[PDB]
Every structure is written in C-alpha cells, then in structure tokens.
C-alpha cells in the first residue's frame, strides 16, 4: 500500500534515486532484491502514465 | 468557472485516513495521462467520474 499510495511526482523521484544507487553500486549489491521488487512494482503500477510521458532524461535513466 | 472531470482508477485502501474520507487515485478524463491522489467523501467505487474544481493540489493525509 505504501508504494501504491504515492503520486507520479514521487514516482519519478523514486526512479531518480534508483539511478543514483546504480551509480553507487555497492549499496545496490547490498540490497539487490528489495530494490528490484520495489522498482518492478512501481513501474507495473504506474506503467500507463510512464509510457504516456515524454522525457529524454527519463529515457536515459531507464536505460 | 471551468470545472474538470476525472475518473476513479483505484481506491487506495489501508492508508491512515479520517473516517468517512477515502483517498482515491483519479485520472483526468480529458487527458488520460495525469493521475492525482484526491480525496472523496461519499461512497465510491472504481471507474466512476468525479468533478474537480482545482487540479493542481493533491489531497494528503488528515490524521
């Protein structure tokens, strides 16, 4: 529920934070399954608006 | 005044909300991208329309 609640502004903020962790690899390999579960659920939930949006920086972040 | 319509996507259960007030994700009926976490009072279910007077603000908690 705590992941379903938040709006898309905080969803985009979440993805920026996830990219920052991917830069900071050691935290990623510390907490790989929690990060992956939260990321896959947040994109499955807000999938429609995220593919409806257009943001090249978001494209590079997702890549 | 220009009012806007919005369709309910998903009722957001298990949030800590005041009794009677429900928290609901709505989406703009005009543009199918924008989703906003608004608040409702009456009995609501999914996929019914709902009129918004201000679109910018979003409803946070009420303790």
């Amino acid at each position: 529920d705590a992941l379903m609640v938040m709006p898309f502004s905080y969803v985009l903020k979440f993805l920026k934070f996830i990219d920052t962790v991917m830069q900071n690899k050691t935290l990623l390999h510390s907490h790989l399954p929690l990060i992956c579960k939260n990321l896959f659920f947040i994109i499955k939930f807000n999938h429609k608006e995220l593919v409806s949006q257009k943001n090249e920086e978001l494209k590079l972040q997702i890549n | 005044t220009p009012v806007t319509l919005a369709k309910v996507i998903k009722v957001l259960g298990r949030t800590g909300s005041r009794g009677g007030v429900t928290q609901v994700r709505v989406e703009f009926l005009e543009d199918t991208s924008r989703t906003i976490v608004r608040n409702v009072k009456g009995p609501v279910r999914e996929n019914d329309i709902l009129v918004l007077m201000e679109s910018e603000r979003e409803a946070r908690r009420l303790r």
Binding site: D1, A2, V5, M6, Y10 | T15, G16, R61
Partner: peptide, 11 residues
C-alpha cells in the same frame, strides 16, 4: 507518528 508511504515520501 507518521505512516509508511508518508515517511517514505518525506525521506
């Protein structure tokens, strides 16, 4: 005392 979701959002 906040709720999960809220504390996640402010952090």
């Amino acid at each position: 005392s906040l709720k999960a979701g809220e504390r996640l959002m402010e952090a």
